[PDB]
Design an enzyme around this catalytic site. Structure first.
Site, PDB file in Angstrom:
ATOM      1  CB  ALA E 161     155.644  39.147   9.800  1.00  0.00           C
ATOM      2  N   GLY E 163     160.548  38.334  12.732  1.00  0.00           N
ATOM      3  CA  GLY E 163     161.355  37.242  13.236  1.00  0.00           C
ATOM      4  C   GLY E 163     162.142  37.583  14.484  1.00  0.00           C
ATOM      5  CB  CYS E 284     152.856  48.203  17.065  1.00  0.00           C
ATOM      6  SG  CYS E 284     151.842  48.034  15.583  1.00  0.00           S
TER       7      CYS E 284
END
Lengths: 96, 14, 93, 177, 356, 156
Positions: E161, E163, E284
């Site tokens: 998302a 990049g 994450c």
RNA sequence: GACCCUGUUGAGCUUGACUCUAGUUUGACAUUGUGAAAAGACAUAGGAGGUGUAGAAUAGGUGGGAGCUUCGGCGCCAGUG
RNA sequence: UGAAGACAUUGUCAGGUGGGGAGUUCCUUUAGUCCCUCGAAAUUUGAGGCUAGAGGAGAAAAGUUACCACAGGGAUAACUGGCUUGUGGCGGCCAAGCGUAGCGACGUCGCUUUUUGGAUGCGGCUCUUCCUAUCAUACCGAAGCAGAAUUCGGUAAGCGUUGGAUUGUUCACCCACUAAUAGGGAACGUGAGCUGGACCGUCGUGAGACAGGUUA
């Protein structure tokens, strides 16, 4: 592209011609310099492709993705005059 | 204290 | 060797602390340490109350006596107001 | 995803030749026996390797979104347009070039036509409505557009005077953010 | 109540917990002091009780306090220089001439610059507009440096998302090969494509499929990268919603999805590769329930893969055991990251080689 | 709420880059310097108060000609919760619908009876799933163009 | 100034049937042999093993278990889990 | 008869796509039995399955926008004129009436809003007259107003009523005298005097150009 091909020619050419192109590349680096110094500095090497030796066109050959490695052969080429021309080459490259 | 001194990107300039 | 004595007020204290940050030295307030090194440590303290007062009384007396000195003192008071107004600010921390 | 038709490549190559000099090199085969092709998804055109296109044919039509470099879009009237995404090829094989100072590059980045007061270097012998890529003095490609005047008229033009009409600037990357 | 008083009591309770044998009470026990710390820290830092537990029970006391200080403090900013256009010292010199305070990001990455302050909007500099650097994070630097891709391969970025990861992989591969960047949603895919075209990558294909489907659509990629969407317990400063929007149902449902995506990556990888059969899994979050229970589900259900060294410079080594859950001894190589130890958002990176 | 914000600001503040991009007015002035011939009425400044969000953004060609002044831009609103009867100054997240003009909705024009997205983090609203709310709808119920402030009521 | 509409244009959004199939692409199986040098998984018989936090202490795991006994050290019990 | 070489090539199934060719007219949401299957975790979940509502002539092109550029058409064509001035808006409580729930003044509470002391993007002089929304001079009432210097307010226009610094200019702030160095009106032309463009034509259309023509 012409600089790198000329260095290859210098590795595989007779001695007087070798010193001729060594002096010619001395001239080109004197005149242009910063334009070509990326071909000797590896940390200025472009990473936007792979060098294509057998290109059909000069722009097709991506010349900034490779650097001049011919010194380790031209410093040990048998001709003392060729060695002096080479050392003048790196002297100008360093004094750029 | 509880941080690695080798790689700890700080806040003040150096 | 050189000596540097600097008079600082409460309003200039933030600028003193900015000076501390610029010099990267440690601050010693009053007598927190028995032997602070004044050359390498920024040591701040007050003054002998006894004579400080005998001197301030002298200043008050000369201001009350000499009118030219009083006029000069009023001029510098106005200048202090203007300079405080126009002086560059300190940092929040 | 389909290959372009005859008229569509006629138009696309007309635009690419109006702003570029060599295109046989663009369509030239590579060392590994592969070539760049032109494809149309939705209404946008795309420049991409044949191998990449053939490996990307599995993705459902409605599930494809990008392929290679987007060179622009065909319009409802059947007229091609170039984009800031199509810039780099123009930079590689540009016909005319104009270099602007920082104080005009920042305007050009906000989307303003360049003027003589901001230009600092020129290409001699440039027609009035030619194809010029806009660079700075550090040779970073910033855009592309059509010159307003020829070179001589640009010289004798008032410094507060348009010399190149903007057609595409890098700011669209801050639009699609 | 007075959160100043509560944080003072937090410090006192940490001290008492640390020196319980010497500094104690008449009858108050370890459980009582720990639970008092729980209420105090929940009321101060604003955490749901469930998550505040997982984090306090995962960390030692002082380390937990420093961890939450790190989660409350924002990070310094950092950029990735694109080797496709320019290089580190040149970009640094340009920005210094323009008025930006830059330093090397460290001796661990040769492609990153850490930014401290500026007088120009860093999102508007001409070299940024032309694609000379990207606004990224070191925690997203790490996964590509785990999955170093060589020239002329087929790579699969499972969720790209932002990049940054796809652009870093393309920069490393020197605009050679084929990179399938899938991203489930269209809205983020627009910004993704904008980022790719800004950085100048010509070897990418953007898709929009449910990533649990790539062994059906293509399969057989040389290298696989999976930044699995997780709770985000390491991006607390960036997204303060996670402090209380992660409950038991979330910590049960999110792993299941991570498990299935990791199985899909294993299936899509190619064992018979002349250059690489590697998969890098990153998340994450800093929660064992999502970072290492999933690598196990991979090594316990697919015996055709093996953990391999990540080669990442620094960190504190991974958890080989937890509460009642013992893992394969192999997990040690997986390296975890946390914000208090290193000013890098807390992420996990695991590296796989396929053999069959 | 105010003590929570005050303690967060007092302690957890560390230097970090934050510079605002140059504004639409001087961007327009630069565009004018780039373009000699000014079409009559090529500019029309948006007089109704607006909310933008990001400091710097390049607008599409479609809306690149509406100018929203900084003196009229707003970023916070006084939002009233009826059941937990209290007014709190909360940040404005986004403009969802302005029921006077679709163009006004697109540009962020802030008028009366206007639905906006407001951050409800500091209130602590508990949902059916027990969850904490971070954004809700609020109807702006005053005329910000006449009253130099934005007042909204939460739709809960 | 501003407002409404029409034509062309640009920006944007939506629709643009279904079933096989050329092309394109992934995986598996097969021709198909003789050897040698390595790796993995299966076959036994053995040997060595288990250090998140807390707990004195490197707790594979489960079962029974309050007494054990190279007869003095342990258990149990109190924790800490 | 020679060379290459157990790799290619090739074949069979399972699949992905297919805006090309031939023929004809599947997923997502909702409510339910806690009825069945798959995945995960153990003391529960997620994805499907069933019931019946809602979404998705056909590669020619079609539909649409309070948007943009150009071109055109239509309405409107100035506008304030017992207008203006000192006390904010939102929501809750309260509340006389009215009304038989709805409307609702003044207050109070919550937000803006708190526990340590530059803005501005047509201006400026001399003289006449008028207003008071009074800076001074005159007279009053109140104030810890001891005296001195004052502050607020009332009647009062008889009488007077600036200059420096800075800025493109102005105000603010500051600096000086002075009793003090107030604010305005001369009525869409703001007292009297003075000073400091739009139509066409050609050629390009992703922007415009013309020592091309015409004209108030």
């Amino acid at each position: 592209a012409f600089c790198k091909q000329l260095m290859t020619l210098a590795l595989q050419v007779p001695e007087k011609s070798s010193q001729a192109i060594l002096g010619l590349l001395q001239d080109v680096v004197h005149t242009h310099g910063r334009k070509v110094a990326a071909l000797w500095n590896t940390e200025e090497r472009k990473g936007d492709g792979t060098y294509k030796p057998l290109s059909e066109t000069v722009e097709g050959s991506n010349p900034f993705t490779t650097t001049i490695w011919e010194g380790e052969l031209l410093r040990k080429h048998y001709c003392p005059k060729v060695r002096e021309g080479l050392k003048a080459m790196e002297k100008e490259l360093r004094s750029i | 204290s509880f941080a690695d001194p080798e790689v700890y990107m700080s806040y003040t300039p150096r | 060797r050189g000596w540097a004595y600097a008079l600082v007020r409460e309003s200039d204290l933030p600028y003193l602390l900015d000076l501390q940050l610029f010099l990267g030295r440690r601050l010693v307030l009053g007598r927190e340490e028995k032997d602070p090194s004044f050359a390498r440590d920024i040591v701040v303290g007050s003054l002998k109350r006894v004579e400080l007062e005998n001197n301030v009384e002298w200043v008050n007396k000369v201001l009350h006596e000499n009118e030219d000195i009083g006029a000069l003192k009023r001029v510098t008071a106005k200048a202090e107001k203007l300079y405080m107004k126009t002086r560059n600010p300190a940092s929040s921390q | 995803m389909r290959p372009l038709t005859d008229q569509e490549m006629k138009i696309v190559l007309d635009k690419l030749a109006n702003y570029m000099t060599d295109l046989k090199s663009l369509i030239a085969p590579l060392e590994d026996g592969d070539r760049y092709v032109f494809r149309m998804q939705k209404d946008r055109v795309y420049y991409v390797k044949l191998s990449i296109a053939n490996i990307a044919t599995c993705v459902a039509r409605d599930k494809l979104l990008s392929l290679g470099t987007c060179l622009g879009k065909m319009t409802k009237s059947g007229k091609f347009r170039l984009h800031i995404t199509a810039l780099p090829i123009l930079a590689q094989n540009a016909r005319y070039k104009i270099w602007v100072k920082d104080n005009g590059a920042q305007p050009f980045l906000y989307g303003s036509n360049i003027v003589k007061a901001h230009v600092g270097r020129w290409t001699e012998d440039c027609p009035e409505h030619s194809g010029c890529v806009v660079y700075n003095m550090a040779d970073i490609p910033l855009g592309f557009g059509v010159t307003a005047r020829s070179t001589a008229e640009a010289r004798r033009l008032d410094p507060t005077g348009i010399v190149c009409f903007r057609q595409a600037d890098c700011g669209e990357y801050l639009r699609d953010e | 109540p007075d959160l100043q008083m509560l944080r003072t009591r937090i410090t006192d309770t940490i001290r008492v917990l640390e020196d319980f044998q010497n500094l104690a009470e008449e009858g108050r026990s370890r459980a009582e002091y720990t639970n008092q710390l729980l209420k105090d820290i929940c009321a101060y830092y604003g955490y749901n009780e469930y998550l505040a537990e997982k984090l306090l029970n995962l960390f030692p006391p002082r380390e937990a306090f420093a961890f939450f200080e790190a989660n409350e403090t924002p990070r310094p900013v950092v950029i990735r220089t694109n080797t496709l256009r320019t290089h580190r010292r040149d970009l640094a010199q340009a920005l210094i001439n323009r008025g930006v305070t830059l330093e090397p990001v460290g001796k661990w990455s040769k492609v990153g610059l850490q930014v401290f302050d500026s007088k120009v909007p860093l999102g508007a500099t001409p070299e940024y507009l032309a694609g000379h650097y990207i606004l990224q994070a070191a925690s997203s630097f790490l996964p590509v440096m785990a999955l170093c891709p060589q020239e002329n391969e087929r790579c699969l970025d499972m969720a790209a998302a932002p990049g940054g990861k796809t652009t870093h992989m393309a920069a490393l591969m020197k605009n050679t090969g084929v990179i399938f960047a899938n991203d489930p949603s269209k809205s983020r895919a627009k910004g993704l494509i904008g980022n790719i075209h800004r950085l100048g990558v010509r070897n990418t294909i953007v898709c929009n499929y449910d990533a649990r489907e790539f062994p059906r659509v293509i399969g057989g990629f040389d290298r696989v990268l999976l930044d699995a969407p997780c709770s985000g317990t390491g991006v607390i400063c960036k997204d303060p919603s996670v402090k209380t929007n992660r409950d038991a149902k979330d910590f049960m449902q999110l792993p299941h999805t991570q498990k299935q995506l990791l199985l899909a990556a294993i299936d899509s990888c190619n064992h018979a590769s002349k250059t690489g059969g590697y998969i890098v899994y990153s998340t994450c979050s800093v929660c064992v329930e999502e970072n290492e229970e999933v690598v196990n589900y991979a090594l316990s259900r697919r015996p055709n893969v093996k953990l391999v060294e990540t080669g990442l410079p620094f960190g504190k080594e991974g958890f080989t055991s937890y509460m009642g859950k013992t893992f394969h001894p192999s997990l040690k190589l997986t390296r975890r990251f946390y914000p208090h130890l290193y000013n890098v958002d807390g992420f996990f990176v695991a590296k796989f080689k396929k053999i069959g | 709420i105010k003590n929570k914000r005050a303690e967060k600001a007092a302690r957890f503040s560390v230097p970090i880059p934050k510079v605002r991009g140059i504004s639409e007015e001087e961007m327009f002035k630069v565009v004018k310097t780039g373009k000699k011939t000014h079409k009559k009425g090529w500019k029309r400044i948006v007089t109704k108060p607006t909310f933008v969000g990001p400091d710097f953004t390049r607008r599409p060609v479609k809306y690149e000609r509406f100018i929203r002044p900084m003196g009229l831009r707003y970023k916070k609103a006084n939002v009233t919760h009826p059941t937990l009867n209290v007014t709190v100054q909360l940040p404005i997240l986004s403009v969802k619908k302005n029921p006077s003009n679709p163009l006004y909705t697109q540009l962020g024009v802030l008028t009366k009876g206007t639905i906006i997205e407001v951050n409800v983090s500091d209130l602590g609203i508990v949902t059916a799933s027990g969850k904490i709310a971070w954004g809700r709808y609020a109807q702006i119920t005053n005329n910000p163009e006449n009253d130099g402030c934005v007042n909204a009521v939460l739709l809960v």
